[PDB]
């Protein structure tokens, strides 16, 4: 996260880290057994780390639970990035508590201008590389489909939305993928892609979770 702030330990209790010997993506806990992340975060051997703040230290509230299933959307397109969503089943159920909690799925899509909270352990620099120890947070608005398509001609599908600030300075970045965009207590987005980080005229692009609610509920229930 570029241009954000330190969340505070366990203030975003649905945020998880996906670990494959190191942190490579985020995710969002949606029940004690299931996490939502991005399809491009698929790897075998994922370990989900819950209750994290400092991801480089063992601080006392962590739960480390292996993925038992990592289910990419069946229509994920790795060239257009359409349907960039994945469901991860935990091999055992997480113990839910004040620092490890689920986030609700949307009941309807969010509108342009709705303010959301984006979080993760991704790079904090727009030029260069600095990866934080602790979780970072950013408040940013959903942008109009028209502005999104203007920023990225030919690239934005009905399952993507843009969020951020056109002036630059505030964005998700490498290592934030898969993580949450939460608006009024609902998971409306998944960190997906962009063009650079925090550049002028280049807002972040996010998977539009509201389009997948029926699929998410049925896939979870079928596995």
């Amino acid at each position: 996260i570029v241009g954000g702030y330190t969340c505070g330990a366990n203030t975003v209790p649905y945020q998880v880290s996906l670990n494959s010997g190191y942190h490579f993506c985020g995710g969002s806990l949606i029940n004690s057994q299931w996490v939502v992340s991005a399809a491009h975060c698929y790897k075998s051997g994922i370990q989900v780390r819950l209750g994290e703040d400092n991801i480089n230290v063992v601080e006392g509230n962590e739960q480390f639970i292996s993925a038992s299933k990592s289910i990419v959307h069946p229509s994920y397109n790795s060239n257009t990035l359409n349907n960039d969503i994945m469901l991860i089943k935990l091999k055992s159920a997480a113990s839910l508590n004040s620092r490890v909690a689920s986030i609700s799925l949307p009941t309807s899509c969010a509108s342009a201008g709705t303010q959301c909270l984006i979080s993760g352990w991704g790079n904090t620099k727009s030029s260069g590389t600095s990866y934080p120890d602790v979780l970072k947070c950013l408040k940013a608005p959903i942008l109009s489909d028209s502005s999104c398509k203007s920023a990225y001609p030919g690239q934005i599908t009905s399952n993507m939305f843009c969020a951020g600030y056109l002036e630059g300075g505030k964005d998700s970045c490498q290592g934030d993928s898969g993580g949450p965009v939460v608006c009024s207590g609902k998971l409306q987005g998944i960190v997906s892609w962009g063009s650079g980080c925090a550049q002028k005229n280049k807002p972040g692009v996010y998977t539009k979770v509201c389009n997948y609610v029926s699929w998410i509920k049925q896939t979870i229930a079928s596995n």
Binding site: A38, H40, G122, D176, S177, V191
Partner: protein, 57 residues
Amino acid sequence: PDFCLEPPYTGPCXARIIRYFYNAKAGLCQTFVYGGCRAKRNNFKSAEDCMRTCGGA
């Protein structure tokens, strides 16, 4: 054009996945951050794969 001589490509996705690329200036396979999509070919999952494919380029 030898793909082993191309600079490493992070791409537009926002993961932080460690991959290898052949660095012809140094003569060695080196690590870089891959964002998770739209990989180019100078992008390997291990040093061994990179050395096999690009070593000596």
